[PDB]
Amino acid sequence: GYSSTQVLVRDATANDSRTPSIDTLDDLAQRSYDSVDFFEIMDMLDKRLNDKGKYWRHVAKSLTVLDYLVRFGSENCVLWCRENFYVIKTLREFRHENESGFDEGQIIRVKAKELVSLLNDEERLREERSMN
Ligand SMILES: [Cl-]
């Protein structure tokens, strides 16, 4: 019931201790230039970027994917972020503390602040994308 690309996004953002591999990130960036795949990718990231609490790994890993797409993927990836900028901005406020009382949300807030800064700086974004 999944397309190839959907399987790839699901694995890249799974609730586990792995970080998205460069191979998978590059696959997603390349596939984002195909409009059918682009929409499949973003729909899955939308779901997982909007997760919370003990499922924070879905959020963290989706933010990793999203940053990579903004830098290396199609222009459509940038367009999506600007449409959905409010949601990305809210991730700067993401909260979750684990059983040990450790703040698992901090990594998400840091990632989100860095992505918001990049998206707010058109020239820097365009320069990075051009060099990539
Ligand atoms: Cl397929």
Which structure tokens are listed for 21?
């591999």
Residues with CB under 5 A from ligand 1 (ion): 3-4
CA of 5 to the centre of ligand 1 (A): 7
CA of 58 to the centre of ligand 1 (A): 23
Phi and psi (nearest 5°) for 52? -160, 170
Deposited experimental method: X-ray
CA of 93 to the centre of ligand 1 (A): 36
Closest CA to 29 of 15, 11, 14, 8: 8
CA of 6 to the centre of ligand 1 (A): 8
> Which domains are delineated in the chain?
1-132 (1.25.40.90)
